[PDB]
Amino acid sequence: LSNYNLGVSQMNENKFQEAFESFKKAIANGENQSVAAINAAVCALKLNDKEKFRYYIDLAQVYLPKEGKSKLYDYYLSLINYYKGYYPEALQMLQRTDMEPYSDVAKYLSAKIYAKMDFDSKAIQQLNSQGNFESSLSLGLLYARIGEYAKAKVALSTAMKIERDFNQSLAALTLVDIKTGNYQDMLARLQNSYDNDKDRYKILDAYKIQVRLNKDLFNIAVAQNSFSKDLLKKQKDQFDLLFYFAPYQVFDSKQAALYIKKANVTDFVDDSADLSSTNVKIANIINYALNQKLRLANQEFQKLIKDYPEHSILHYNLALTYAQMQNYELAYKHFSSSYHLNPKNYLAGAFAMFCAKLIDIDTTKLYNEILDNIAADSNFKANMQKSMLFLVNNNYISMLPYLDETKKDTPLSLIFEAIVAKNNNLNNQVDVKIAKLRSELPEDILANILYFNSLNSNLNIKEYAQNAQIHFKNLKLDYRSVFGGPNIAREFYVNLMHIAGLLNLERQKIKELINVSGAKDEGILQTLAYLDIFAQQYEEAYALYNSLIDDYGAKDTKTLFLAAVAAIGANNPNSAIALLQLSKLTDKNNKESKAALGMLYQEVKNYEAAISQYKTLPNNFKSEFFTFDINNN
Amino acid sequence: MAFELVLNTGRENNQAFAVLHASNDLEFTCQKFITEAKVHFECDIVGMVDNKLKDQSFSAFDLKFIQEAQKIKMIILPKIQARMFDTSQNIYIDKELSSSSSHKSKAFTFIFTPELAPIKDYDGLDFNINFPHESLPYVGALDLNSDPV
């Protein structure tokens, strides 16, 4: 009934001018000066007049001490500080308001202030402590900001029902599902919201995204945990290590031994595959392959196969060169060709199944074929392949008998025994197997790394780093030519130097070596590019990879994938798309390239092709190389 | 004088609470140069033309002014841990709260408090939180004295 009461009673009826006039009259009369001033300021702000708002807010303070005895003093002070831009003062003063209808409003304003100043946990707590305002969308967004996606999904799904928060909640939930890895859930959610096709594309247009490299790659603790404890406990690592030490088949070992300079010829060449020119050509290309020159050997095998297209050994050798080069689909192709041209070459079939498992394809028919051919044979002097056949299936008990045999020692045998022993928690004989492996191969990078990781496994991070630094300080390596074999040796050396924090000094050493002279080999350039990628120096890595592609031959899946990684690091989404398409052209079912392509297409705003790549992924896939962040500018 | 500083001091638990608000009609810059374990908050202002501005010493921070040709450099040395915020956006009208970590605006807030916390790293998505309920707050019905019915 009072002038202030009459003004505020008109003012909630969406009538602003009459209420403002009533507030002016109340202020002139002299009733409830401070609260009338605040309400008059908010009414003036309802219309477009900033000067009057500032004037009335400034005027509100001078009457404040008059209302010094008021149970809502805290709220009035917090509101006055709230409209003046003095936010921390308002937040500090808002927590003392315990009146009945305003406590919830005070907590909501405190949540707003906390959210502005990047204190997400306190904002979530304040919103949860409220039971008057539905804060589902804000809670979901804050949970997504903190990183608790499990509750973010529930909050956003709850908020989706309300009509007003439909589009924003849908877009936020879509991005959260992409981040977590559930793609089919995202597509199913999108399909049930709209019936048209343009409308479904506008949900992805709400927030702009930016592709980024995963932060978990550069974390030393996780790398140490996964390297010193689970080195041989991974299918990809097991297969790569088996490919490295695998032998190269020839016709006659005695003839080939005279054309190879390794001092371990009898351990890397086998003649169990049931012309002199073919023998000498095989020996020459094999010598090229073993002496840290892989690309040239692969090219030579590819060229010479076109001349003689029916030889089970040649297909195996080319497939092995491809497999050690992280080119798995052509490895599958030629391994299967080798096995089909000669069904008594069991190593070829085992490696074919390994390659077919690494890419996504069904290999049950091949497994049954080798099993039938095993059960029907006059002699089975090669039991290693029979034991290896079980590796594709996630079972390891079946190879336990293999650890008790009268055996000739070849590096493949030792590494297989190490894998078998490690995968049955027999963590004691792994060390002796690896020690014998190193004794067999003195001058090898991977053997040295394996022995170091076996001997110094039971330590902390600091002791591991210090020992590693001491060990590699006294170790001399010819960097120019020794990183020129299978890619796993570089990768593991780079990982170990990353653990020890020594890769900056090695980077400087390799640069100096490069700057000493002019044109050189591919191995140093690839090692330096990988080090740059792992040292968070993306521009140099991208330049080096472009030089590799356009100067030497680098049209491989792994090289193009790493070049795309570097380009994404250097903020070049357009080049990353082309590089990833060229990489996927060979390895079609690459689960990591597809997610990156989808994210990049979303960043470039090409939603027609973004859904196409997302439609070809499982409902549980966390990319270990790529992630995305929201671009707010 | 188009450029204004206000200082507000208070108590929290048994500590100190210093808030410095800097405002200008145009956009100016402030940065958090670290040096070596001694943060130096450095602000660049166009300043138009100003007279000799004396430097004051305060409980939680020290102020210095450098006046070049039509340029003003404000140097803040905090004796306790300090942080910076860009409170340029009007929260009391807006519903899409943007980020407060910006290096150029027309209003800046510097907070000084001993019992603070280090910024943690959270793997999350930098969303803009939407608060759709309370936009323009006001006081409800009251009596002849400031108190709810």
Author numbering:
A (entry chain B): 178 to 451, 462 to 820
B (entry chain A): 15 to 163
What does the literature reporting this entry say, word for word?
To determine how the spokes interact with the rim, we improved *in-situ* structure of the spoke-rim complex at 12 Å resolution by 17-fold symmetry expansion and focused refinement ([Fig fig2]) in addition to solving a single particle cryo-EM structure of the PflAB complex at 3.23 Å resolution ([Fig fig2], [Fig figs4]). PflB is mainly composed of tetratricopeptide (TPR) repeats and can be divided into two parts by a β1-sheet (aa 386-390) ([Fig fig2]). Notably, the last 5 C-terminal residues form a β2-sheet (aa 813-817) that makes an antiparallel β-pair with the β1-sheet ([Fig fig2]). This antiparallel β-pair resembles a “hook and loop”, as the two β-sheets are separated by 423 residues in sequence yet engaged together in the 3D structure ([Fig fig2]). PflA consists of the N-terminal β-sandwich domain, flexible loop, and C-terminal 17 repetitive TPR repeats. The N-terminal β-sandwich domain and flexible loop region (16- 163 aa) are resolved in our cryo-EM structure ([Fig fig2]). The β-sandwich domain of PflA is made of four pairs of antiparallel β-sheets and here named PflA_AMIN_ for its resemblance to the AMIN1 and AMIN2 domains of PilQ in T4P ([Fig figs5]). Interestingly, the long loop of PflA (126-163 aa) wraps around the N-terminal extended TPR repeats of PflB, mainly via hydrophobic contacts ([Fig fig2] and [Fig figs5]). Overall, the PflAB complex is akin to a “wire-wrapped pendant”, with PflA (wire) looping around PflB (stone), forming a tight interaction ([Fig fig2]) and assembling the PflAB spoke-rim ([Fig fig2]). Deletion of the β2-sheet from PflB results in complete loss of motility ([Fig figs5]), supporting a structural role for the β-pair in PflB ([Fig fig2]).
The motility of the human pathogen *C. jejuni* is driven by a complex flagellar motor in each cell pole. The *C. jejuni* motor contains three disks: a basal disk composed of FlgP just below the outer membrane, a medial disk composed of PflC and PflD, and a proximal disk containing PflA and PflB. The distal spokes and rim are composed of PflA (spokes) and PflB (rim). Around the stator complexes, one L-shaped PflA binds one PflB via its flexible loop, locking 17 PflB monomers into a continuous rim that holds 17 MotB dimers ([Fig fig4]).
